Amino acid sequence: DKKQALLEAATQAIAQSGIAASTAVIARNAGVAEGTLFRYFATKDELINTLYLHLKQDLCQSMIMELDRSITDAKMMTRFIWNSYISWGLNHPARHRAIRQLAVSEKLTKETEQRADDMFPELRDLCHRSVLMVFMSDEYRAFGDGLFLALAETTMDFAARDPARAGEYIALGFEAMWRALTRE
Amino acid sequence: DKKQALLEAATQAIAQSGIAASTAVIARNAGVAEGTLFRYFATKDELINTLYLHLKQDLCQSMIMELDRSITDAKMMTRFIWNSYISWGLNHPARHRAIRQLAVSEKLTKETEQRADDMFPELRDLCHRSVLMVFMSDEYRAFGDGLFLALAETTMDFAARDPARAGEYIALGFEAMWRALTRE
Ligand SMILES: C[C@H](CCC(=O)O)[C@H]1CC[C@H]2[C@@H]3[C@H](O)C[C@@H]4C[C@H](O)CC[C@]4(C)[C@H]3C[C@H](O)[C@]12C
Ligand SMILES: C[C@H](CCC(=O)O)[C@H]1CC[C@H]2[C@@H]3[C@H](O)C[C@@H]4C[C@H](O)CC[C@]4(C)[C@H]3C[C@H](O)[C@]12C
């Protein structure tokens, strides 16, 4: 209720100003007292981690609905996932913009990354597994996520500005992403 | 003089606010009267095209200085070019941020793109030619430039935030770029 309202105004504020967004600004735009914000998130760090999970759950639920679990080929399954990402970001630009900033923030906790991997099993292995970014050492997975998000943002930009060619930008960006971030 | 001052304040303003940056804001920060700005650039469109050329000349002059023209291999020559881009953007973040916005703006004229290709011959063919983005139809070259810039920005971000691994981010981003934007 007030929580959904607070997460929504945090989304918009971080989309616009980054992890720096002020809590009072966020509380104001949710129409709650800043102290009430603190009852929901005592710290900027907690807010970042909860918002990330909230956004990531939203995204993954959208993927679950678009997904044809019969698909066996990893490239084709990866294309469908890319297409659902791109379309989620085009429908919800601030959600994409916020999650992009959260995903690279260094404030995400290992618990949070555990709750990320955990609570969508459907996505673990109705997709066999991986191929994407398997080739990178652990220390660079944040970087490989940053590259994926850079390519997806650019794809969305072009597709929003030139909708008559949206599908073409989507397929070219996918290929770029696939070539960049997978291996033999 | 006042022109260099005006281009410098346009760089900073577009870096911060996009092609939308106001001319009065720009004139103010250059410490000239807005009418004097109009003597240098009568239109926002002219300013965009002149600024782009100014930035692109700066970038290419930096590449000319780093370049070992003996290199024959296209991948190795392309790596050197990427490395000089990344380092130019890390040294001059607003220049990169402005040129990124200009490069995708749709206000760049064909004359301007002619003056782009023209006035750095050294770069045409002390590099044999191309490989990069040759596979795309003409209509998508702006998109392929957007992808290159997305990858380079991300690489710079990580390298500025984690300098002890700057070289590693640079080499991983390069490979991503090379795989995305070239073909067999
Ligand atoms: C679900 C899918 C794995 C499927 C596969 O390759 O078979 C994974 C691989 C890449 C992942 C994305 C990339 O890791 C980039 C982003 C990282 C952010 O932490 C979450 C959203 C984010 C956009 C990710 C969502 C999702 O977990 C993706 C899309
Ligand atoms: C000089 C080099 C061509 C060399 C080669 O592959 O052999 C080209 C190929 C890609 C070019 C870059 C990409 O086209 C992306 C950007 C496009 C902007 O219009 C200029 C800067 C920009 C960053 C370009 C500068 C320069 O002209 C590059 C780096």
Residue numbers in the entry:
A (entry chain A), B (entry chain A): 8 to 191
Task: Give the article text.
The local transcriptional repressor RamR, which is located directly upstream of ramA, belongs to the TetR family of regulatory proteins and represses the expression of both ramA and ramR.
To elucidate the recognition mechanism of cholic and chenodeoxycholic acids by RamR, we determined the individual crystal structures of RamR complexed to both of these compounds. Electron density maps of each co-crystal structure are shown in Fig. 2b and these structures were refined to resolutions of 2.0 and 1.8 Å for cholic and chenodeoxycholic acids, respectively. The structural difference between cholic and chenodeoxycholic acid lies in the presence or absence of a 12-hydroxyl group, which in turn results in a difference in the electron density maps of RamR bound to these compounds (indicated by red arrows). Comparison of the ligated structures with unligated RamR revealed that the binding of cholic or chenodeoxycholic acid triggers uncoiling of the α7b and α8a helices, suggesting that RamR recognizes these compounds via an induced-fit mechanism. Instead of a π–π interaction, both bile acids form four hydrogen bonds with the Tyr59, Thr85, Ser137 and Asp152 residues of RamR. Both bile acids inhibited the binding of RamR to the DNA, in a concentration-dependent manner.
